[PDB]
């Protein structure tokens, strides 16, 4: 078996959660690989990343992964947070605490 030469982390799973009236984003990729770097906004965090999404915030993320040639290639993936932060932050809409302003 082999973990890290596989060109398969394109699908790095992500979960959304309500934490203090903001949409907390959690991009989880594999922990079987080192150097598989995950980047979302201006924050870079190893295998698993945790940030937030508000209107205007990025809807793409980069995954840096080494190839079979030993060379690293960064791949852009688009996942819409606007479609999971509106659903997770639903009770905060009825009471006007999200978007983050006012």
């Amino acid at each position: 078996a082999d973990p890290c030469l596989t060109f398969n982390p394109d699908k790095c799973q992500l979960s959304f959660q309500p934490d203090g009236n903001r949409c907390a984003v959690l991009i989880k990729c594999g922990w079987e690989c080192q150097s598989v770097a995950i980047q979302y906004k201006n924050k870079t965090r190893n295998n698993t990343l945790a940030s937030t999404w508000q209107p205007g915030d990025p809807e793409w993320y980069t995954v840096s992964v080494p190839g079979a040639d030993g060379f690293l290639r960064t791949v852009n993936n688009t996942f819409i947070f606007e479609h999971m932060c509106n659903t997770a932050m639903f009770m905060s809409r009825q009471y006007h605490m999200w978007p983050p302003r006012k």
Binding site: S15, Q17, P18, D19, G20, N21, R22, A24, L26, K28, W31, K43, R45, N46, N47, T48, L49, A50, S51, T52, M97
Partner: protein, 264 residues
């Protein structure tokens, strides 16, 4: 940044119900971190906060052994403490624990802490210094001697500084996005009268720590001190009555961390 907190431990001797149960909980500020329970379906410690899930199995597998170790030292310590007072094994007693550090605005080491508890209140606590303890019982002295021999205070002091603190800042930078928020509490102003002859509250704030001052007068009788309460999401929530025509000169002053100005 006036933000740092603690780890909690709870061990309950069961009414002849086999072995005690053990609860390991952790916290950074009023934001909880880790969840261990001995009668939980998972023999691992669970992350309830998402921004500690940026940590790998190197951090989980290496922290699930340690909490089990804590459960064991607890489950033995209670056997000792009840074994050397006056109890019956059919009895049910409780032991709660504490150790940890705080930090200032420069995120540099503010003084750290470490305390224990039997059935009662204070048993043994690390004093606000380094090598010392504060005991007030008789068994307390024998066990604190037991910690004077093992040279515990400094070996715990080397954790209070340089292990709790850099991990604390590490947590403050890996969860920087969720600890940027000094959520200001929003106020209204309501009234209700029952006899022919009010309310000071805050609704949505991130640190629970808020003073709610209620003219040049001091009080002793009129206000009912209420505890600050969780709003179940990471926010928190927090009365005085007067003659019906004279509730109109006073105001409620509020000082909060997310409030740059005290509110009239």
């Amino acid at each position: 940044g006036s933000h740092s907190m603690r780890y909690f431990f709870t061990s309950v001797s069961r009414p002849g119900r086999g072995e005690p149960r053990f609860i390991a909980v952790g916290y950074v500020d009023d934001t909880q971190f880790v969840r261990f329970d001995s009668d939980a379906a998972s023999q691992r410690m669970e992350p309830r906060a998402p921004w500690i899930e940026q940590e790998g199995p190197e951090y989980w597998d290496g922290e699930t052994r340690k909490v089990k170790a804590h459960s064991q030292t607890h489950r033995v310590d209670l056997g000792t403490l009840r074994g050397y007072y006056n109890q019956s094994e059919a009895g049910s007693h409780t032991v709660q624990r504490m150790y940890g550090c705080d930090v200032g605005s420069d995120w540099r080491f503010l003084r750290g802490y470490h305390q224990y508890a039997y059935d009662g209140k204070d048993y043994i606590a690390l004093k606000e210094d380094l090598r010392s303890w504060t005991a007030a019982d008789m068994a307390a002295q024998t066990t604190k001697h037991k910690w004077e021999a093992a040279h515990v205070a400094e070996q715990l002091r080397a954790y209070l500084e340089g292990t709790c603190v850099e991990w604390l800042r590490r947590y403050l930078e890996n969860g920087k996005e969720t600890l940027q928020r000094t959520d200001a509490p929003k106020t209204h102003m309501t009234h209700h009268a029952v006899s022919d002859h009010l309310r000071c509250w805050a609704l949505s704030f991130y640190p629970a720590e808020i003073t709610l001052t209620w003219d040049g007068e001091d009080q002793t009788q009129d206000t009912e001190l209420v505890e600050t309460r969780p709003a179940g999401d990471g926010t928190f929530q927090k009365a005085v009555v007067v003659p019906s025509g004279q509730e109109q000169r006073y105001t409620c002053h509020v000082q909060h961390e997310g409030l740059p100005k005290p509110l009239t």
